[PDB]
């Protein structure tokens, strides 16, 4: 069919239906236990909870890094203002893939395409990408196989065959999955083959001598984006990307509302203990009932509950996530409580992850470019 | 109106009713003194006979030059595997000017575009630009004042400043001046980006420390484009490029048919004395009459006799050129024996340029890469 990130559902999104009408399989149990296998330690809770759900060329990926083949795990990120709390999923689970495989890691930094969707400047752009750098860095990477660029920084290195992808792509092919209005700039048009020439081992000289797979990770939001990719890898051929896909994070209105996370939508990585206990408290859909006693005699829809669903997609231990999905399922939590337990979770997230980024001073990650420079 | 380079008219083509219709100045006699004033030498017969004969900002050029601000002579070329006699004309010409107000020039050969109109692999786009330096060096410019670069190798420090443009125009303001078909791919519609970028001081920051005037040299052909490049100029504040236009060079079948130049069509940079002897005594399009008496009383029609009009555009002595001009109008010179003197012509012309192109050998262009470099 071909639209724009506006695949769609109701009440809940399916994914099942979603999982199927786009033509990719969901993460198989299996695929998991392999995974254990190889990493030699417990899974990561976003794969066990299936935050992470649907897969490409998953076992490909897999039969490589278990071959000892050259591989990379890559990240797109479009820098921005205020950072939402979504951003930390796949940096950190990139984080645990790259620990688990010992495997390079390239992210992407969309200055470019920023400054043209008229958003920043070139030197705003530049001041976003910097303080992005430092959200990155946080995560604690193998800084001596993690390679995050600029686009404008690293253009040159990756234009010819960036050339070699915008030659490969029909715009008829594109103007669906972004609404280009042909008032649109011309490099707003031809931004696709930024974003998709990055995934191509071909890109990246000074760290591959053969074709390398890519392991991309992304939001199911773009899934048909990625089926163009792979029509572009066959038509130049490229490596066919195996990517991995994860849920929706839902703004704190619920669940089914899908706007562009901001201050106002969603808790930001910049948060305050206060701030983010506020929007859980205040802000956060409910799925409770009314009657405090229809919630006993009912029970409680974790199902919208936006202070739940975040729960189970951020949390450490799976074993108090299912005491709550348990509790506020049989009446026995009011949503108050719940968002008692979840304000202080996210709390705790929040304050961890803050410790971690204290130190990403800026000497740091002017140390970090010079021992990254090339 | 805005229409691709097949702005019309019959029989011949007018000029005055194109440069007025268009928006732009021929070139007024006064401009051609003030040239050979601040030249201190006289005047090129491509001024004097109007092979340039029309004029954007050269007034404001001239007050530049003359004021010792800091100025640069623009071209770009588009990579091809034939190189046509076209082709000479704003070389020979940049040269010309190069020399009377010793002033930088800068070339830009198109080879990602190339690529990007399916015509030449990178590779084969490479060999390409590399023969045509070597073309473009024969004109012995001040090599310490002429930087001819190649898009896929000087991309990067001009991105920025091409990401600027890319945002300021509308494909709809650009997808009537090239026939783009959405079938067509992202790159080629990003293009004209590229083509306009490199006429602004500010793509060239080692060359540049204050905006630069540019003097682009170009065909009437495409004045329409230029106009497009005056509006990004204002909508960058960045300085609208004085252009200098030119007659077409008329291909071997009159004079009326603009195809695209060709082995076929016209007289090839790289043809020997016995070849280009062939084309204007076979292939040129004659003006003359059928009965010879006719031709006595009656005439010649330099008009539409591509013999002559070549003369006219690429001879050095305007006094050979009237004597023919005159005799050939009053039906003294049979056709034949003007395509004896047109052949001569010729034939000194490519055999010179050839002695000039003989020593620029591969170890030559390397060195001025080389000495180019940084």
């Known amino acids: 069919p071909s639209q724009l990130l506006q695949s769609f559902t109701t ?34 809770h976003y794969l066990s909870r299936g935050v992470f759900l649907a897969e490409k060329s998953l076992d490909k990926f897999l039969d490589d890094v278990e071959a000892k083949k050259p591989t990379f795990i890559f990240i797109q990120k479009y820098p921005q203002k205020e950072v939402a709390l979504e951003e930390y999923i796949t940096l950190e689970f990139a984080r645990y893939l790259q620990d688990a495989f010992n495997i390079q890691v390239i992210i992407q930094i969309l200055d470019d395409i920023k400054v043209l969707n008229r958003e920043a400047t ?38 010819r065959t960036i050339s070699l992808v915008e030659k490969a792509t029909a715009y008829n092919v594109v103007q669906p999955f972004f609404n280009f209005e042909y008032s649109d700039n011309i490099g707003k048009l031809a931004s696709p083959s930024i974003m998709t020439a990055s995934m191509f ?26 089926s163009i990719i792979d029509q572009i890898a066959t038509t130049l051929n490229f490596i ?16 089914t509302k899908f706007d562009i996370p901001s201050d106002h939508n969603s808790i930001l990585l910049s948060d305050n203990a206060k701030q983010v206990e506020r929007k859980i408290n205040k802000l956060a859909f409910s799925g409770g009932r009314n009657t405090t ?11 919208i509950d936006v202070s739940f669903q975040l729960l189970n997609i951020f949390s450490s231990d799976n074993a108090q996530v299912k005491d709550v999905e348990e509790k506020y399922s049989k009446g026995e939590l009011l949503s108050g409580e719940l968002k008692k337990i979840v304000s202080a979770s996210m ?10 980024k204290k130190p990403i001073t800026t000497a740091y990650l002017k140390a970090y470019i010079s021992k990254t420079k090339f």
Chains 1, 2 share one sequence.
């Open 11 to 44: 009440r809940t999104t399916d994914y099942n239906q979603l999982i199927n009408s786009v033509g990719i399989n969901a993460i198989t149990p299996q695929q998991i236990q392999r995974i254990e296998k190889l990493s030699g330690k417990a899974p990561h």
């Open 122 to 159: 070139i030197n705003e752009a530049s001041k976003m990408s910097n303080d992005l750098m430092k959200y990155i860095l946080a995560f604690g990477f193998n800084e001596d196989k993690t390679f995050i660029y600029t686009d404008y920084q690293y253009f040159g290195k990756m234009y």
């Open 201 to 226: 081992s071909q890109s990246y000289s000074h760290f591959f001598s053969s074709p390398a797979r890519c392991l991309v990770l992304d939001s199911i939001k773009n899934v048909q984006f990625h």
């Open 240 to 255: 066919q990307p195996t990517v991995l896909f994860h849920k929706m994070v839902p703004l704190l209105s619920g669940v």
């Open 293 to 303: 006693e229809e919630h006993k005699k009912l029970g409680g829809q974790c199902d």
């Open 347 to 356: 709390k705790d997230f929040i304050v961890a992850y803050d410790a971690k």
